[PDB]
Design a protein around this ligand. Structure first.
Ligand SMILES: Nc1ncnc2c1ncn2[C@@H]1O[C@H](CSCC[C@H](N)C(=O)O)[C@@H](O)[C@H]1O
Ligand SMILES: Nc1ncnc2c1ncn2[C@@H]1O[C@H](CSCC[C@H](N)C(=O)O)[C@@H](O)[C@H]1O
Ligand SMILES: [Ca+2]
Ligand SMILES: [Ca+2]
Ligand SMILES: [Ca+2]
Lengths: 225, 225
């Protein structure tokens, strides 16, 4: 992982994360384990900060791009009020169906609008008309990393001024800091994409940011205008 | 408690932290280098999250326990509105005086009430105030680690419902996750103090928490009732 030791990571999770993690999330996280790409599920530690932030801002309307088996989606639904509404976009319905049973048992399916679609199409479609633009309290971008910069353009219209946009995987295995020659071939494409995204966000005068080493790296942005 | 490599840490600092850090904070950081215990100055990355949270909640009235040469104090002062008011407590005025010229250059001394006192004494005097309870938006506890549990008792009374209390050094050099036999003698007292503090915060029904590996570990709490 990103910390000095796996033991340190496990200490944080056991001490402060797992005891406060909803039972349904645990259940989903366990179901997820049987998936061949289980590693894609959102870090429970990153999730804990997402929850904290959602509650701090009393987020009610949110959007998630990249749902997979549903851990961040369920965490978000559990964090927001009973009347909260989430727009959840992914082109993989099969993966969503792995976490859906836990979303149902948790009593929060009513909060979720799952949109099975290419993400760019879905986001641009939402930006037609007036009911979506500037309406979201919080956005989570966790889909295909080479498209993050393009998603940022849309999220910065979808999320209201003063709202939050978070990007996952912004340290990409630590590889973004390493000399390129040390990096396995399979990691290079997203390494490049994430480096470019990080530079963009750090420079963007339209946001305040915090780039955190939680899970695989997560960056929270507040929209200034 | 830190990251897998110095390279990764320096990447985050240079890419996302230092370019957005206030000039006067850098100045203070440089002055701090001359103090024999300079290592006690707050991590700029933890600071960047502190600023983010402070702005997110529109904190105006804050309290800091453990000032040293002033990095977190100045960061807080720059984060809150012009009419913001900070109660800043430390028994070492000499260290405060190292940061004070930068606080003055920044034009924020007027926000700060520096109390040169034992921390528990200052907090208990504050609490004799008939209207002190629930008056603070944000507290930062960064003094002597064996007293963190007692400080929490006080901070839970001083900070408003929905307010935030943060504790620094909640991973104590990573030692909290190591068997005691692998830890230097001089680190053992605070290792145990922080282990117990973390257990207390994790189990406290009055708060929601997030325990983060930024700097030496920082835990943010939100008071629920
Ligand atoms: N162009 C695209 N449009 C929509 N979804 C996409 C996409 N490219 C990749 N994805 C989706 O992005 C997801 C990345 S993994 C998302 C992880 C999820 N947040 C969790 O907590 O489990 C995958 O489910 C994948 O199907
Ligand atoms: N019992 C006590 N009462 C008041 N201050 C105390 C104390 N024990 C330790 N301290 C103070 O706690 C501080 C810890 S270091 C504080 C670091 C500071 N937040 C920064 O960013 O620079 C020291 O300055 C020390 O003098
Ligand atoms: Ca992810
Ligand atoms: Ca002096
Ligand atoms: Ca400290």
């Amino acid at each position: 992982g990103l910390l000095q030791s796996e033991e340190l990571c496990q200490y944080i999770l056991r001490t402060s994360v797992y005891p406060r993690e909803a039972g349904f999330l645990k259940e989903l996280r366990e179901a997820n384990e049987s998936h061949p790409d289980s590693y894609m599920s959102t870090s429970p530690l990153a999730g804990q900060l997402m929850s904290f932030v959602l509650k701090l801002v009393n987020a009610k309307k949110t959007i998630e791009v990249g749902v997979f088996t549903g851990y961040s989606l369920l965490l978000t639904a559990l964090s927001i009020p009973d009347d909260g509404k989430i727009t959840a976009i992914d082109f993989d319905r099969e993966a969503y169906e792995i976490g859906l049973p836990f979303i149902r048992k948790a009593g929060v399916e009513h909060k979720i609008n799952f949109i099975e679609s290419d993400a760019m199409l879905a986001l641009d479609n939402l930006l037609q008309g007036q009911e979506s633009e500037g309406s979201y309290d919080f956005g989570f971008v966790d889909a295909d990393k080479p498209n993050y910069i393009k998603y940022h353009e849309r999220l910065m219209k979808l999320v209201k001024v003063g709202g939050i946009v978070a990007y996952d995987n912004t340290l990409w295995g630590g590889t973004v800091a390493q000399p390129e020659s040390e990096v396995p071939d399979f990691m290079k494409e997203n390494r490049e994409a994430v480096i470019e995204l990080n530079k963009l966000l750090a420079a963007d005068p339209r946001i305040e940011i915090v780039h955190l080493p939680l899970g695989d790296g997560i960056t929270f942005c507040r929209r200034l205008y």
